[PDB]
Amino acid sequence: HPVRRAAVKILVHSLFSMLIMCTILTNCVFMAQHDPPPWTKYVEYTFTAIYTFESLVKILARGFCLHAFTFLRDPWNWLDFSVIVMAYTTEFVDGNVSALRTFRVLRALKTISVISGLKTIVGALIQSVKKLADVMVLTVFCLSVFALIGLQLFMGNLRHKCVRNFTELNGTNGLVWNSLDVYLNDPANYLLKNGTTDVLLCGNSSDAGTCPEGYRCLKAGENPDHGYTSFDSFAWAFLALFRLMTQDCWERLYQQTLRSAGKIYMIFFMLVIFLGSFYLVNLILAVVAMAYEEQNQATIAETEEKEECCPLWMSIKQKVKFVVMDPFADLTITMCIVLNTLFMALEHYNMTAEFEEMLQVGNLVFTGIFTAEMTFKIIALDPYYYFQQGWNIFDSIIVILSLMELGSVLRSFRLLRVFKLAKSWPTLNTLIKIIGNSVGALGNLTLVLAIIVFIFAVVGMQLFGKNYSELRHRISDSGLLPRWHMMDFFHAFLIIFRILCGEWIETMWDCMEVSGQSLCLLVFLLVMVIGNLVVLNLFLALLLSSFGKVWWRLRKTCYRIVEHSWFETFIIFMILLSSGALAFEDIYLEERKTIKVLLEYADKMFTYVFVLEMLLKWVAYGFKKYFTNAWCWLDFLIVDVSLVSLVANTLGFAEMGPIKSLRTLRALRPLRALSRFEGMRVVVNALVGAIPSIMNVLLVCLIFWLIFSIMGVNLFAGKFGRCINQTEGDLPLNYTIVNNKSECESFNVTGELYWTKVKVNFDNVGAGYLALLQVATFKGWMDIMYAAVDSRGYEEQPQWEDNLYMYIYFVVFIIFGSFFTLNLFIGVIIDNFNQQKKKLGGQDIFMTEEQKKYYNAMKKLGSKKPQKPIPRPLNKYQGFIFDIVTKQAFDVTIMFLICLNMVTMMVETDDQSPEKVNILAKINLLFVAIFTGECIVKMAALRHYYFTNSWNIFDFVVVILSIVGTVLSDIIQKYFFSPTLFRVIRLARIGRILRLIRGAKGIRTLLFALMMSLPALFNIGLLLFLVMFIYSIFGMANFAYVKWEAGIDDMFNFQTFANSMLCLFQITTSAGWDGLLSPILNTGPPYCDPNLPNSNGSRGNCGSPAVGILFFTTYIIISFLIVVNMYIAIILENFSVA
Ligand SMILES: *[C@@H]1O[C@H](CO)[C@@H](O[C@@H]2O[C@H](CO)[C@@H](O[C@H]3O[C@H](CO)[C@@H](O)[C@H](O)[C@@H]3O)[C@H](O)[C@H]2NC(C)=O)[C@H](O)[C@H]1NC(C)=O
Ligand SMILES: *[C@@H]1O[C@H](CO)[C@@H](O[C@@H]2O[C@H](CO)[C@@H](O)[C@H](O)[C@H]2NC(C)=O)[C@H](O)[C@H]1NC(C)=O
Ligand SMILES: *[C@@H]1O[C@H](CO)[C@@H](O[C@@H]2O[C@H](CO)[C@@H](O)[C@H](O)[C@H]2NC(C)=O)[C@H](O)[C@H]1NC(C)=O
Ligand SMILES: O=C(NC[C@H]1CCCCN1)c1cc(OCC(F)(F)F)ccc1OCC(F)(F)F
Ligand SMILES: *[C@@H]1O[C@H](CO)[C@@H](O)[C@H](O)[C@H]1NC(C)=O
Q1: Which of 722, 723, 754, 1082 to probe ligand 3 with, by most ligand atoms within 8 A of CB?
Q2: CA 44 – CA 204 distance, rounded (Å)
Q3: What residue spans do the IV repeats cover?
Q4: First-to-last CA distance in the chain?
């Protein structure tokens, strides 16, 4: 038929796909708008018309009722049918809620149907979620187990607050309240943690927060920040542990818990962090990588299987070719490029006039140099080369661009010259290859990601815009717009970007406080899971596609005594005790007047014994076999430091600058441990066995962040210093009161006004590097961005959102500097570890010889063939019962009963009700009776069911311990009752839940992989604990007495050793390190008080910026590299065992 022919031709045409695509794109640009004019209503009709016309084309290109069913058969078409009927209904009939008008975002999905490769990527991205099923089950299982643990441990524990004393009068029941009635409604009376608008927590233990004089603490209170962080009511415990699993702002929950319960529970938090968070996240990584790998093999595999005048002009041309035949000056011009990078790099905030003049002079110099090079090389060999070769293309592009610029985004063009260093730099060539594959092979998947971000940004914006705009007061401190809202579309895209980066809870609290918990949790959890999944798939695709006789006498005695094991154990326990003596060096020495001199003599004895064994090594091994090992160098340097410190102590001239400014370097004393301990040694050989690759890629990222930092100097410089007034510690008042720095210096007639910059800012390339590290690591970036998207003038006060669209600077950076630079680091580092494994031919690293024995035996532990299957008991009743229990049904019955027990354990909260405690206790007795019955029958299977297999003895011991738990819990009243000793007997009930590992198979395999990785992780964490130790002692001697600011409260400090190890624990996960650097960087008043009384003679309460940045940046790099070791061990183990 004619109609059918026409329809088919249109359906197959290549032009109408472009039609559809442009219509969808314009629909998207019309959809991103909030409160559109009434004009757009007819454009909506136009869009519906085009959509229905295309649907008509498709159904008539099939051309019958059955054909319509065939059109419907393609699942992507269902989306189009739904959207046409939805547009038709929304025009036909609309009491009126009009909520359906956000369903038009489904049209944006049609892009993935029209593009040739988009649906391919989305279909290959669903299979990853289908492989991720076992890890999702294990993740929710661990989250549930840890949720029950934290629920019993911290039930309603976060509620604690610092309430002002209780005033009780005999009569009834400046006062005027009635106990519970006044207190819950009390809040203002509550004590507000200093420097923050949050309730302060407390604790009855002698480890939680000390409450000031006049403030006792009682569980009676509403909840923490907004009511969503509470640990009671297992639902919210599952929320808070999903938060500790994504590590989203987990330092806040960690600080709040340990402020409530007691600093001991950092054991719980580090158990969750180092086995729940890290291990589950890296298992997700591993399984996504494995699926992709299989697809690549198959995908790669499937592809593989296939069946002026003319004579003067010419003369001068030939002669100039003869003159400049050979430039061969790439070294000269590359040194010119390097000098130009260094010359632009010499920009800063307050540049002297002559300095800026010299900058411009060298500017013109280098521009002339580069034009000269281009002209000579274009009149040298051939202009068809500068026509063809893209290298010459962009060289000349930069030439013309610089000329146009000489003819503050202005200087963005000069910084293009930096890139051409890549032609001889294989590593920067690899980063260039990565950035190219981003928009090349993986361009379709980047498109999937962009479409997803768009869909969610427009969904959220017109789901919560009215709410964010009218309930704005319930979301911000003062009457103002929020810093993060969804009313516009730029801001909704920023919220979805933030959620992509990994920080969702802190804006979901707002979205729930304004909109409503159900759908807000729905959309944010959805964007979390989906967006992080596509980001993970993109990251992994890129990282994959990147590829006399007394002399003899004494010397023999010395050899025998040095190879004597008791001597080695002597020095081992010696260095242990010396590290301890270091650990006792906190601020409370002045109160410990005996341990002072005890450790004095101890230090003298340590340096004596160590120089003694040094001399023994000297006279025994000879100056060659000694100075050949590097650890001997390490011991020699350390004893050298201690000896010079000691001799300068005794022989006068000490206790002033250097020296005694070196005795803090004594905190390297633990470093002797790496030499002797067989695990730290192998892991360190694996780490410094990578400094080549690490330093290469760090130079690459230093050049790239140099580009970005120079851009940041030009855009922001001096544009950051607010001039905030003294009483409130915030931005001045408004732009009008104090607009300019030249105005606050006029209005400072009273000493109230200060014009002080933000701590981390862009004023050099140094602080530029620092602000980029903070931003690209995601911790501490809130301050940089707020100050930058407030930057109005050059020294003018910042209005609240002027220069708004800068946010795009941090967006483009964060992408190109964290999803790409950290992709380079990770990819190269992982490749390096793989190469090391291949070279060792052993293929195993981080494990010593005995650890290899453990590993092989544990691998053998997975023996598949059982013993004699089962003996029939030869007895009548034993036979009947053995038949009724050996059936595979019996296991499923017990499994459902124990999942019902789990659900019984999920439903307790704090202060539930007495009758509820009774019902739950009776149900506990009932389940322990059922399990005792299962136990006795199993033991009566024949004779040995409770000894044949490890799972059975686990069942047996948990049954016994549950019986004991009941028989002790009912007799609490007779002998003695305790508040906390009951919780431990209550918590061993979690043992029953762990039965579920048996019937489950995926959970068993993944947990077994973790078990096989436990020794490697042990050695790695041993090195990490040693590093926490070194750094904690260094900070204890260094970072003590610093002012109490954002990340350093009374409980989390560097004063004692407990506090330092805690702060360093949270900084191990890169968390909160902005908060701990913030009080070190400040030098000088207003905030600090240089020269202040201290317990120790040393004066001042302000940290050293120079040493603080070194400390924190180096610790982040080291810890990041060691948790890359963790990621690597985990991935190897997973693949190896599954
Ligand atoms: C830390 O020790 C505190 C002192 O023992 C303790 O305060 C006590 O808390 C209990 C409630 O758990 C109070 O008992 C009160 O409870 C009933 C309602 O169930 C009230 O009607 C009565 O007022 C009754 O006294 C104790 O009175 C109270 N004791 C004191 C001295 O204040 C804290 O509870 C302990 N820690 C926490 C956070 O609970
Ligand atoms: C900083 O900004 C202020 C803006 O108020 C500039 O102000 C002088 O301020 C008076 C206010 O009475 C204005 O009428 C003048 O127009 C301002 N001068 C100029 C040149 O605009 C102040 O000059 C600015 N300082 C610098 C160094 O630019
Ligand atoms: C505003 O006035 C106060 C007066 O108290 C200034 O405070 C002094 O600031 C200088 C540095 O500029 C310090 O050296 C002094 O120690 C501070 N006062 C003291 C304690 O003597 C403040 O700097 C002024 N701010 C501006 C922007 O002018
Ligand atoms: O690699 C990233 N590292 C950032 C960590 C490193 C350790 C310390 C704290 N910050 C990384 C950076 C991202 O920035 C935003 C986006 F790229 F999404 F746009 C997003 C995801 C990222 O990693 C997720 C992945 F890829 F592993 F799935
Ligand atoms: C909080 O800050 C105030 C500042 O006035 C100080 O007096 C108090 O000791 C601080 N307390 C804690 C627990 O940080």
Answers
A1: 754
A2: 64
A3: 870-1138
A4: 58
- The first and second tokens of residue 777, run together, are 């690591």
**Contact (Cβ atoms closer than 8 angstroms) between residue 368 and residue 309:** no
1049 in contact with ligand 5, CB cutoff 6 A: yes
Determine if the peptide bond prior to 659 is cis (ω within 30°): yes
Q: Which residues of 2-14 are buried (b: 16+ CB within 10 A; e: fewer)?
A: eeeeebbebeeee
Residues in the chain: 1138
Distance between CA 22 and CA 907 in Å, rounded? Answer: 53
| Ligand 4 centroid from CA 773, angstroms | 13
Q: Is the distance from the beta carbon of residue 204 to the nearest atom of ligand 1 less than 6 Å?
A: yes
Residue the block writes with tokens 């701590």: 759
**Is residue 201 within 8 Å of 161, Cβ to Cβ?**
yes
916 vs 1136: CA distance, rounded Å: 48
Of the candidates 906, 962, 904, which has an alpha carbon nearest to the alpha carbon of residue 933?
962
For the CA of 539, the closest atom of ligand 4 is 26
Q: Which sign, positive or negative, has the C-alpha torsion 60, 64, 70, 76?
A: positive
Beta bridge partners of residue 796, listed in sequence order: 740
- Ligand 3 center to residue 750 CA distance, Å? 10
Place of tokens 């004590």: 191
Centroid of ligand 3 to alpha carbon of 752 (angstroms): 9
Q: How far is CA 1092 from CA 148, 1034, 1085, in A?
A: 48, 21, 12
Residue 498 in tokens:
């933030």
Q: Residue whose CA is closest, atom 6 of ligand 5?
A: 194
SS3 sequence, 196-247? CCCECCCCCCCCCCCCCCCEEEECCCCCCCCCCCCCCCHHHHHHHHHHHHHC
Tokens of 645: 């410190």
Looking at the DSSP bridge assignments, the partners of residue 199 are 192
Rounded CA separation 1101/1084 (Å): 9
Ligand 2 binding residues, C-beta < 6 A: 739-740, 742-743, 796
> What whole-number distance in Å separates Cα of residue 725 and Cα of residue 733?
8
SS (HEC) of 288-346: HHHHHHHHHHHHHHHHHCCCCCHHHHHHHHHHHHHHCCCCCCHHHHHHHHHHHHHHHHC
- HSE, CB side, 13 Å, CA atoms: give it for residue 350: 2
List the one residue out of 822, 131, 828 whose CA is nearest residue 533: 131
Cited resolution, angstroms: 3.2
Cβ–Cβ under 8 Å, residues 531 and 500: yes
Residue that has been written with the tokens 């032609």 in this structure: 423
Residue with tokens 């361009």: 443
Q: Report how far residue 566's alpha carbon sits from residue 396's, in angstroms, rounded to the nearest whole number.
A: 73
Given a contact cutoff of 8 angstroms between Cβ atoms, the answer to whether 475 and 510 are in contact is yes
Q: CB–CB of 687/718 below 8 Å? A: no
Cβ neighbours of residue 694 under 8 Å, at least 6 residues apart?
A: 825, 829, 1121
Experimental method: cryo-EM
- CB-CB contact of 150 with 231 (8 Å): yes
User: How far apart (Å, rounded) are the C-alpha atoms in residues 244 and 497?
Assistant: 20
Class of 550-684 per CATH? mainly alpha
- 971 exposure class (CB count in 10 Å sphere: 0-12, 13-18, 19+): exposed
Beta strands in 161-205 (DSSP E): 161-164
Residue 444 host element (H or E): helix 443-470
* Rounded distance between C-alpha atoms, residue 1087 and residue 1101, angstroms: 10
Cα 719 to ligand 3 centre (Å): 21
Ligand found nearest the CA of 742: 2
Give the position of tokens 């036979």: 879
